[model samples]
Target: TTYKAPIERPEDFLKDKEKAKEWERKEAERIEQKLERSEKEALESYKKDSVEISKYSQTRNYFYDYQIEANSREKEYKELRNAISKNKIDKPMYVYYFESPEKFAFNKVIRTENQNEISLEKFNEFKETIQNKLFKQDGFKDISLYEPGKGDEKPTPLLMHLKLPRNTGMLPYTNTNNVSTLIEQGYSIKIDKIVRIVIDGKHYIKAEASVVSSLDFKDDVSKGDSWGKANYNDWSNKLTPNELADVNDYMRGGYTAINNYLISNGPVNNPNPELDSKITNIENALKREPIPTNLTVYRRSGPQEFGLTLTSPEYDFNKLENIDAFKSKWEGQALSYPNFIFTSIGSVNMSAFAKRKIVLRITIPKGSPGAYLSAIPGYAGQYQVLLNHGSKFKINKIDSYKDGTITKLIVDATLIP
Candidate 1:
């Protein structure tokens, strides 16, 4: 966790204003080059260990491909559930779900006074009682008979595909504005870094739930997409279609005069002065940093996870190309809506948890626009490289594989120079 030189400190460029500017430029380039090399090296390292997961290219809408895969999985879930009754395993049913951070809090209040250990029979009885109360709950709250293992051994972990009501499955969230409502609706959340593992009646152990930004990279990725969409909608709602088009054109041009005018003057068409001003600030900050050249960064996109897998899965990379080479998406979007990428695959996996992820291995060529944001407070540990809106990446190679249920997909594409 110690800070390192060049990457952590570009202060070597200090002193002598004139020379400082030159030194800063050279040092930044050096940092960029080193980061680029390290990113590719890290990817190779990840690839090696991952020979474990068995692993594509086409120029279709990547988002569309994601939707298709999601639909396919959704269908699979339905089919699997349908087969349950026909299989005729009428084993005694029990429900099981882990302590969602909120549920954990509530359960603490019910820690049975003088908590007594239960016999196998009592355990089964209690499980049934708890199951009935939580039956209609969403997420991993699965209603299934316990899989008592082989005669010689007991199951180590109870893994099952519990039925989740449509759109009610627990998804990650950034804010806890309505904590109780969010928990009730099945959003996975955590209150502290320390996680408590309760064993027996009173014994417990702890594990650290890691992170910064108060959310995972995946959560932030979705946030950026949503915020960008909202900003666009906010603007669209305020202006006529032609005026919106004109505003979009003005935004793309990044004109200071027009931006200041829109913010300062009460233009009848410009309803949200606050948004216009925010746009100016974000763009100005983005303009300050050099576009990292030849650097590799990662971004996860598309539909949310619909199912689970046992082994490490592989994803098809061709399904990840958001737009064709030379074309750009999210142009002129605020850096707040700016695309997020990790400088290291390690950073990517750390936040991924057990969820199946599709990552874009974006290689930035010279003149590509992005700011290395790891230096920012609160983001220092994330190894984030924030890409400006509309930056282009040309998909060169996509590697993807699906070994039955396990899947892996990674796209190797370079920024259009």
Candidate 2:
């Protein structure tokens, strides 16, 4: 006997569409709130960490840029020297520290704040703090401070020097006067060399300073006696008191012109353009070239045919050392063949020519050598038999056989057009 059950259909099955829509709406709202909360939390965390990271990153970038600019300027100086066979006089020389107009302006700015301005001690302390923090971690042993008037010549009112410890890994500045500034300031800091180090990925930073040796300013009259005589004649020509005053003003105008020229053409304002172009050229040349098709060949003979079976899958034939070893093995085996004879005719003749067919296997091993062996046309040996030749066919496919132990290369020489 079979039992029968009733199958029932709900009368509201198609009419409950509004209820299904309501469930989907509620589910969407839940997901939206969850995403909103996640975003808010992430933003809050980023805000908390950004301040310190921003400060450190900015300071690092500023110092790195300064180092690059300094090196670029040094290269300009070298190029100028090379072109003229002597240092160019008009070229603005770079120094680690200077009592130049810029330094004077900086001092004036500081003096205005401290009406009771005593000396440059505060500025010196500030600079020293920065140097210590930035350079101490990488073997900055000591810093020597110097001012211009401290020596026989008036110390530059705002220059200093740093003497590094012996064997310090730093490059020395090219200018000798900058080095003298450190020596004169009574600071024991060494100015011997400059060094560079990499802190993080793609961040290379260096610390270096320069010293100038001489500051000889010869008067224009020294150019020739004619110029001195002309100046004497001008001085002899007298005028009324008011006229003389006007003449003095006119003469002083020349100083203004000179000052404007110096300010506009200063190193900080106008960088060496020729050197910049050369640097740009070098950067462009560093781009990667096309990848090349590479091939490697290796053959080695063992004591017996069994020895030959013990092939090294790891050895790369493209390597010179490996190729030499293969050649040595092949020669040893060929010499042992009873029918082979070496003659002065530059050919080996075989009476019975064993015609042993050697199997060659190739592989692109893990960490295989890169494209090092290019098949350029060239004659190798003194014999004309080693003639320049081109590849007869282009390699089309690489096939692996014998459980990946041997690689059979297929080349095609079909010509179209």
Candidate 3:
């Protein structure tokens, strides 16, 4: 589709340089004429439409027959551009707007002309909503709205609209907005997917345009959309000299792209230092050595004779605090048994070891197995008392208790009594 001005004869070039230059002058004038005509139509059709004006609050689709006029002008745009002998540029010289959620979608670009009366810049967001979110899907889509009719050649582009508002960061050429007034019609909310279909005209330039529109019912789509990925690039497409179809054709588009990006990299919660610090202390305490309390032992005679006439469960050395409150509650059994001895040890920094057991070291008095077994028979099994912690524990270490003479016994303990 490369075009060049004709100059085959020697006399053609010799006639005048102005002949070859004449095409450029006429082409420039044609573009200006297109702009003027587009503006004249917009002022006629959009004068009563409040939504078209940015500073206004009211919204209305005052021009109900705008679609009929647009299609009629579209044919004119095609015819005028096809006759041009100038070069084709690489962008859209037009911008089109539509009501996003259509009544029913089909083969054609069913963008609603009579859309809801609402303003996008008006609403303040609520607590729950996806604001300033972006999504990205993989691969390109195989769907489009515009195609060449049989036996008909591709169409050409023309200036579709005029100059826009001074502040254009939000795409001044469009009327489609992501405002909630249009989104929430009831309990079910309305979502939007903006798309760019690659338009191809064999003789015309390959270019794209900015338009808010809908598509046909699709079976190829499961997740993601036909819209190119969410970015400023779609907004960055520049103006082209002449268009054949939608201009933003170079874009890779789909619905999943937007869904993927927002769902995968959304907002997260911050850490709580106070909770972690407290848990750290508890973890360190579990690995620590336990505190020790006093050990009382009495070498005994026989079963009825008893080691120390003390069977009261209150004397169980379960807690370190219990050692602080030890009292003589025997029937003068200490004086009766001169062989007994009481030795003590103390520990302070064991609050973390509150649920832990206090270890007791008992010397067997260098006696026989029978003498050892008879000494603390009641302290061995059924009568062995332990404090209550959050969990239960066992006497995991009773050194050489197999010989029935455990010189050292290690019982796991608890924080409570």
Clashing residue pair totals per candidate (backbone < 3 A): 9, 31, 22
Candidates sorted by TM-score, descending order?
1, 2, 3
Model 1: residues with Cα > 4 Å off, grouped in runs: 1-271, 304-348, 352-356, 401-405
lDDT of each: 0.32, 0.24, 0.21
Question: Which regions of candidate 3 fall more than 4 Å away from where they truly are?
Answer: 1-5, 8-70, 85-267, 270-417
Q: Which segments of candidate 2 are over 4 A away from where they belong? A: 1-77, 80-96, 99-108, 112-116, 119-131, 135-147, 150-157, 164-417
Q: What is the Å distance of residue 150 in model 1 from its true position? A: 60
**For every candidate, C-alpha RMSD to the true structure in Å:** 26.4, 38.6, 38.9
Clashing pairs in 1: 55-400, 55-401, 313-407, 313-408, 314-407, 314-408, 315-407, 315-408, 315-409
TM-score of each: 0.28, 0.15, 0.14
Q: Write the per-residue lDDT of candidate 1 for residues 289-385, one digit (tens) a residue.
A: 4552344455654322212233323223233442221112221111121222234312134334334344555555545545544433332234455
Clash number for candidate 2:
31
Across 206-323, the per-residue lDDT of candidate 2 in tens digits comes to 2243321211111111232232233223331333444334323322343243223333553246655643333232222211111112112211212233143334532334344643
What tens digits encode model 3's per-residue C-alpha lDDT throughout 1-417? 733323121211222424323432343344435344544344233334423222110111111123323434334322222322122322222222122111111112222223222222211121012122111111111111123233423222211111111221111111233110001000111123222222232221112222211111111121112221121113222222211011112111221332233233322233335433332332232223121221111111121222222343333344433322332221111212111111111111122222222232222111111111111222221111111112211111111111012111122111111
In candidate 3, position 115 carries an lDDT of 28
How far in Å is the alpha carbon of 124 misplaced in model 2? Answer: 9.0
